[model samples]
Target: GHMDGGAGAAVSRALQQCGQLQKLIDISIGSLRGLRTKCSVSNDLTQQEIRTLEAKLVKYICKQQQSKLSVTPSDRTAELNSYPRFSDWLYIFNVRPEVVQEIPQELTLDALLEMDEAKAKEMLRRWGASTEECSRLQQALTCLRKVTG
Candidate 1:
């Protein structure tokens, strides 16, 4: 029971982050979908213009997710937010289906890294360290925290 409780806590934290990731993914996919509609109107769109548009879409979605994550950190939500963008991108780029399968797994790993960083930072803050592990953890969390953006 004790182990279960501990595991549950970790899972809960992870799920919260995952949820945030999922939101990011959803926003990204939605942006791409909208872009596709716009791009479809013209066959003469230059490659450079297309790439620029794609980048803009991705950046816009990432920024939106970043704001959401900053306001609320939850693993499940983060993970859900992050899972779809890569897939949508692959579809947009017409990447192989096999490659698309890898995106979710990669994102999952990323979410885990994020969770670890968040947990470490939380520990540091709770312990009240100014210039030691806490500082490092704070930096790490900030770095991981940037992924949402």
Candidate 2:
């Protein structure tokens, strides 16, 4: 297939943006964790609220990461316009899975649901259809639930 220079550039830019987003997530996660344990203001927020917010932050970052991967320059301008820059910013400030895994399994489910319902559903579907993927997901889920719960 012939390569489109513009599309290639866009993909490159998107990957760079994704990397920055991951960095942001890592920073945010660190900050949030610090606030929970190190800050005197930790008592200001309930544990549930903090977990929910962390989950939300992770979900937003993941969504932006997925969006960066999915975007192509050939895609409609309007579709490109719909991408959330704020989510990108949030991703830049938070801790990604590559850095640390803090969010619990059920919380991850909540985050995935919030981030990309379609992708989450598709993942579930794939896990159901593919034995290898299913086994991986099951093991990961089991570990997460055991650790977090």
Candidate 3:
């Protein structure tokens, strides 16, 4: 049978929404479940058929990763983007390009300099920063303020 482009497209979009490694695997697994459930319910593809489909789905995600890396022709930006998870935080801190969007102006680098560490930490706390995430960003914020001052 012909491949389902729509099935591949849906899972590819879900995986690319984040650059996290393990998260990609989770998304892939979830994608297979969605495909399998519909196929099972409708009696379309058999369990063995969908089982092999996971192989195809995983390939799609790996190709997505390759595409992301290829776009970052610059070595530094590639390194930044390839870090698996920190790229999101890097974008928020303005350390990387503006891959992240709709950021609070106050949460950005320019504004972090004005606030003390506690204030910055508090801001992230309210913004739903994880403990480790909050701590690391606060560290970057403090370091920047000290260096800039």
Candidate 4:
């Protein structure tokens, strides 16, 4: 959508001013150069801060585009299959490696979305995830269900 395209340009401009444009360019979407007044220049930031901001912006833009196009479960599953690495999802849900290592390496967002919640809950708890971590993961599972179910 044009909105995503426009946000892509704004994000690109922000990253550019932060001396971080190449990172965005690497993802290819940042190639679009829209004609708009620039947003605020980035703060005097560390590399990690810039990276985190870039990641958040990219995720939000991608989500906007997804909502525009997502309709059926097939589309939703397609989006899940193309999900960024499982480890990334784990990080977002605050599942640490201490517990993560015990979980099946092949466990993926799509797989979790397809499982019964009781089964999913058991699977997560079996891996020694703290109660809070398991709850967060269940929440993510619910979100995925809503998105794809």
> Please, what are the lDDT tens digits per residue for candidate 2 over residues 1-149?
13432444455445444454555445545556675456565465554555555655544434433443444434414323333332332233231333123334444443543444345434554434244543444443332223320
State in Å the error of residue 44, model 1.
5.6
Give stretches of model 2 more than 4 Å off.
1-14, 21-23, 35-49, 68-149
Judged by lDDT, which candidate is best? 4
Estimate candidate 3's alpha-carbon lDDT, on a 0 to 1 scale.
Answer: 0.43
Q: Rank the candidates by TM-score, best first.
A: 4, 1, 3, 2
Give the deviation of candidate 2 from the true structure as CA RMSD. 12.6
lDDT of 3 by residue, 40-77 (tens): 45554544455554443334333333333333213223
User: Judged by lDDT against the true structure, how good is candidate 1?
Assistant: 0.43
lDDT of 1 by residue, 84-118 (tens): 34444344433333433433454432453445665
lDDT: the better of candidates 2 and 4: 4
Q: Per-candidate TM vs. native?
A: 0.32, 0.30, 0.31, 0.45
* Poorest lDDT segment (10 consecutive residues) of candidate 3: 91-100
Candidate 1 Cα errors over 4 Å, as ranges: 1-45, 75-80, 90-97, 102-148
- Which candidate wins on TM-score? 4
Model 1 RMSD in angstroms: 14.0
- lDDT-sorted candidate list, best first: 4, 1, 3, 2
